[PDB]
Amino acid sequence: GLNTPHIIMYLTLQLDSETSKEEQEILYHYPMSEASQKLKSVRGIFLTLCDMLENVTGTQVTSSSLLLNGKQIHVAYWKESDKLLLIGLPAEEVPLPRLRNMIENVIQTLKFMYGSLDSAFCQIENVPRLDHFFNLFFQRALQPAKAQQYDASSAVLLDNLPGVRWLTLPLEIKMELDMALSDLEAYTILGSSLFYKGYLICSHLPKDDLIDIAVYCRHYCLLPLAAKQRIGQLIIWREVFPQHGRYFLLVVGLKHYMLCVLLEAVYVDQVKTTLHQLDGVDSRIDERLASTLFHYVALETVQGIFITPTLEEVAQLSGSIHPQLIKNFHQCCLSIRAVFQQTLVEEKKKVKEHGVLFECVMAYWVVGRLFLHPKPQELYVCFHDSV
Amino acid sequence: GTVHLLCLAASSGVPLFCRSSRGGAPALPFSVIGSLNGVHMFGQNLEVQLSSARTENTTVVWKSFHDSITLIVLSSEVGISELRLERLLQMVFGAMVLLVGLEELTNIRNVERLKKDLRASYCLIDSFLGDSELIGDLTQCVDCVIPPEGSLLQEALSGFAEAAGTTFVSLVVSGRVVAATEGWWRLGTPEAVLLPWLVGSLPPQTARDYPVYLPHGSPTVPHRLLTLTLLPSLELCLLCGLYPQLLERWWQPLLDPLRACLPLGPRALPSGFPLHTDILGLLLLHLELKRCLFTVEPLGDKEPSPEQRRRLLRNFYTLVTSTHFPRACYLVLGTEEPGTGVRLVALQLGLRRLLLLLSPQSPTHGLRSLATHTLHALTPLL
């Protein structure tokens, strides 16, 4: 990752100043290192290509593929208003559909943070914050590291999905959680979403807002997984703009709970009291988490959640080549998502039972199924050829 | 479905031609082509290639060949893939080499004469751009048709080759080769696809003598190619480094088998071949033998348009080249309403990759077993 080139850049499109210095063009540029000086120099072709293809083609540039020094580099564009935002990473680690999903998430998160991304980048005070966020994001994209690898192995697709890791809730615990959340609601609370061990254990938030908050947490290290060390006292109280006056994101992480609230224009004390009485629910959920479809990535896009076997399950399901089986699943799911993504573009403008088979000795037969007429959903399955 | 191809003088920075196939084969500002030339050159100086700059509606691919020629494509095709464009540029450069050669293409730059030499290439280029009936332009494999179980055809081809004193003699139909000399088979893959394609693209004449420069055989030695039209849509290719009568010496007693394989051009399958009723498309690929058997019409009931079936198979191949390169695939597609669409299957086994289009009612459970049975049936054929 350190050696591979990677750039985030914010040149000013349609610049009309004869001072062609890099500062005049570039408004923000996080790396500013050896791995990015090349792209900083070659920004001219990016600008010229973007404007020319905007001219000839009714649509703007979404992706340019440059074979730089013998290695492939995908750069994703974004033209909004006299401004252009470019993200370039090597292909051999992040494929192009993953890069497009990643730029979509990045733009969404920036708009979430500082509203108009133009004001996000023009300001100088927030530059250290943007640099830290982009450092973490680039590290996530290029360095999967830093049972500890299953989450990293699957994050190729889990970050791609427009959903959130959801846990099959027992009904009694479900109503207990709903009662607790209602008590918490009883500024202005616009909903909430409680997570356990990184699993979305309850969600009263609207789907778009919940997705925005979850991806904001994912871009950081807030959301844990694999039952990490109990979150001590991390409380975040920030301003946000979830495409809807002044809005605040609150989030308290105590023990394994990762509770979040959205507020509209002292609440930490009441939410702490609310989660304090939730001292028995974790016990009731521990053994539930503990307790031939070898792997399913069943999704619910309308709800914004998806269900996959827990890490304890895959540890129980660990077999001869299962550690390789899961990663093979998760890299093929990217291609399945790519074709389904083309189909989704076709659907939102106004294919369905894709599958492959592997033998790198058991017939994995990973298959992606799409549902559109009912509540739209995706189902990625494994099964031996016998079944 | 609009494609705008461009060839440019790389070092000179002057347009060479702008063959386009927008809305079909019948079909640009100087400033815009200068702009793409400028961005390509800026990439070249900065030692960074420009493989693709795909937009939402279009997709482009540059190719700097021998640092002397520059190739651009503007493909607004729905579901266009990078591999299809890369193959198209590679093979169109192969065509340009065939029509002119290494010289006058690299090194020496003809400012205005090269226009005159390239004037002849336009027919082959726009045949390439249009939705032809062959796949050699995509799969890089020569399009073949199984002969009607006759070795006498190969024996007579060898006899004709001996009589004409040439090791490159091949009987080609509708652009698909049905018989060839061993030298023709061993001949390099880009020109192997090109030569039958050029013959098919050429208008039918009694006999044609044309100069060709083999991209791998002889880019500098101007080989001569003779097309002998025994009957329309079938030709004899005689490729040598001048007035043979041997066509009636050898092919006259071979008239009956030749008439038997005459309709096999579009058929690309032996008459009465046992195949599963669900099969609506065969695209057998033998990469070891560098051949492809492409049957598009085993049934004209569902998806009656053969053009639609060919486009579907080509898109499936462009999607499976990324996956494949025991392993199999299936990409059931179409409208979300049940009983519509198609089922596309892929199998790879011993360099014998095969694509199967199936009926919309074809069951999805036994798709792999169906593919294995089809591959076993077609194994002796190719």
Numbering used by the authors:
A (entry chain B): 302 to 447, 456 to 495, 512 to 569, 587 to 607, 623 to 648, 798 to 856, 876 to 885, 899 to 925
B (entry chain A): 8 to 34, 38 to 251, 259 to 342, 362 to 418
Article sentences:
Last, the TLD proteins Fuzzy and Inturned act as GEF for Rab23 (5). All longin domains of Fuzzy and Inturned are well resolved, but as in CPLANE, an N-terminal PDZ domain of Inturned is not visible in the map. However, analysis of the surface properties of the Fuzzy-Inturned complex reveals a mixed distribution of positive and negative charges and no conserved basic or hydrophobic patches. Fuzzy-Inturned does bind neither liposomes generated from a neutral lipid mix that has few packing defects (PO) nor charged liposomes with increased packing defects (DO/PIP/PS). We also could not detect any interaction of Fuzzy-Inturned with liposomes that have a high content of 5% PI3P. Our findings are not consistent with the previously suggested function of Inturned and Fuzzy as PIP-binding proteins, pointing to alternative mechanisms. Thus, the Fuzzy-Inturned complex may also be localized to its target compartments by interactions with recruiter proteins that enable tight membrane binding. Furthermore, Fuzzy-Inturned could be recruited to the liposomes by CiBAR1 and Rsg1 but not by Rsg1 alone. Thus, CiBAR1 serves as an adaptor protein for the mammalian CPLANE complex.
The tri-longin domain (TLD) RabGEF complexes represent a family of RabGEFs with a unique conserved structural core. In each complex, two subunits that contain three longin domains (LD1 to LD3) each form a heterodimer, which is required for catalytic activity toward the cognate Rab GTPases. We here report the cryo-EM structures of the Mon1-Ccz1 and Inturned-Fuzzy core complexes bound to their cognate GTPases Ypt7 and Rab23 in the nucleotide exchange transition states, revealing a conserved catalytic mechanism with distinct modes of substrate recognition. Thus, TLD RabGEFs rely on both conservation and variability in the switch 1 regions of their substrates to realize catalytic efficiency and specificity.
